[PDB]
C-alpha cells in the first residue's frame, strides 16, 4: 500500500551525493517511519540502506500524502566526511558530548582567572 516516488532528482558529484524530494502515498495509515522507507529507497536505487539519508517529512492535511527530502551517498566513508553531525547521530555513527553548554561557559571564565599550566588544573 505504501508507495514512494521521487521528484526533482539531481546528482551532485562535487558532494558525492544524489538528492531528491520524496513523495510518499500512505492512504489511511500514520506517517511512515523513516527507517521503513530507507529500505524502499535502497530497493529502488540498488544500494545498501545505511548510506540513505532522509529528513523533513510533512504530512499534508487530509492524511494520504507526505513530502520529504532524501539524498543518496556514494559510500559510507564519504557520508561521514560531509554530513551534518546531528544527522549521522540519528543513524548512530556519531555521539556528541554530554557536556551542558552552560557548564562550558563558567569553566572558561575560571581558567581565565588563572595563568600558566594551572589553567588545566582549575578545570575540575
Amino acid at each position: 500500500t505504501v508507495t514512494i516516488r521521487t521528484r526533482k532528482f539531481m546528482t551532485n558529484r562535487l558532494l558525492q551525493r544524489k538528492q531528491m524530494v520524496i513523495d510518499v502515498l500512505h492512504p489511511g495509515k500514520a506517517t511512515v517511519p523513516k527507517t521503513e522507507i530507507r529500505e524502499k529507497l535502497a530497493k529502488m536505487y540498488k544500494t545498501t540502506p545505511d548510506v540513505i539519508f532522509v529528513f523533513g517529512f510533512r504530512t499534508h492535511f487530509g492524511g494520504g500524502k507526505t513530502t520529504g527530502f532524501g539524498m543518496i551517498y556514494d559510500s559510507l566513508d564519504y557520508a561521514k566526511k560531509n554530513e551534518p553531525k546531528h544527522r549521522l547521530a540519528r543513524h548512530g555513527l556519531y555521539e556528541k558530548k554530554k557536556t551542558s553548554r552552560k557548564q562550558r561557559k563558567e569553566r572558561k571564565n575560571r581558567m581565565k582567572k588563572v595563568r600558566g599550566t594551572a589553567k588545566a588544573n582549575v578545570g575540575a
Binding site: 492512504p27 489511511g28 492535511f61
Partner: protein, 185 residues
C-alpha cells in the same frame, strides 16, 4: 532585529450606523438564506466586493488604451470569471460594477455542497464540511468558506475515508453494534 513578517490585514469593516432597521433586516436574509455564523461573515464579503469595485472605478476613470488600463483590466476580469461570479461572455470592466454580494455567497463551498445535493439543508451542508466529509480533487476541505473555482466545481464529492463515502462506520454505529452483540451474547 528578528526574522519574521508582521504583515497582517483586517478582512472586514463595521457599518457606520449600528441600529438601522433597513440594514439589519437585509443582512439577516443573507445570514439565514446561506446559513452563515455571524454578521462578520457577511461584512467581509461586502468588503471584498468593495475592493473589486474600487479597483474598477479608478480603472474606468483611466484613459482607455493605457497599458495598465488593459493589463490590470483583463487580470481583474479573468479572476472573476475563474471563480464564476461573472459569466464568460459578459467580461468587460464596466460590467462588474453591476454585481451583487449574493453572487459571491453563491460560490462558497457551503452553498455548492447544498446545490450538488450532497446535503439536505444549507445548514446541514456546513456540518458535513466541518466534520471532514467533503473533498475537492483528492483534498478534504475543513472549512465552509472555501470558494470554488469554476473548473473545480465539478469535482466535489465525499471523502474516501468517510462513513458517507466508502469508509468505516463512525463511533456511534460501531459502539451501538458492539453493544448489540455485546448485550445479546
Amino acid at each position: 532585529p528578528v526574522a519574521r513578517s508582521w504583515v497582517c490585514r483586517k478582512t472586514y469593516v463595521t457599518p457606520r450606523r449600528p441600529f438601522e432597521k433597513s440594514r439589519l433586516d437585509q443582512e439577516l436574509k443573507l445570514i439565514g438564506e446561506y446559513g452563515l455564523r455571524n454578521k462578520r461573515e457577511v461584512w467581509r464579503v461586502k468588503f471584498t466586493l468593495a475592493k473589486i469595485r474600487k479597483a474598477a472605478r479608478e480603472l474606468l476613470t483611466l484613459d482607455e488604451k493605457d497599458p495598465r488600463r488593459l493589463f490590470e483590466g483583463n487580470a481583474l476580469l479573468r479572476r472573476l470569471v475563474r471563480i464564476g461570479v461573472l459569466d464568460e461572455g459578459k467580461m468587460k470592466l464596466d460590467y462588474i460594477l453591476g454585481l451583487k454580494i449574493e453572487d459571491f455567497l453563491e460560490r462558497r463551498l457551503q452553498t455548492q455542497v447544498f446545490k450538488l445535493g450532497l446535503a439536505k439543508s444549507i445548514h446541514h451542508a456546513r456540518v458535513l464540511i466541518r466534520q471532514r466529509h467533503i473533498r475537492v480533487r483528492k483534498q478534504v476541505v475543513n472549512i465552509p468558506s472555501f470558494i470554488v473555482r469554476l473548473d473545480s466545481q465539478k469535482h466535489i464529492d465525499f471523502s474516501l475515508r468517510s462513513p458517507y463515502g466508502g469508509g468505516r462506520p463512525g463511533r456511534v454505529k460501531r459502539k451501538n453494534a458492539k453493544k448489540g452483540q455485546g448485550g445479546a451474547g
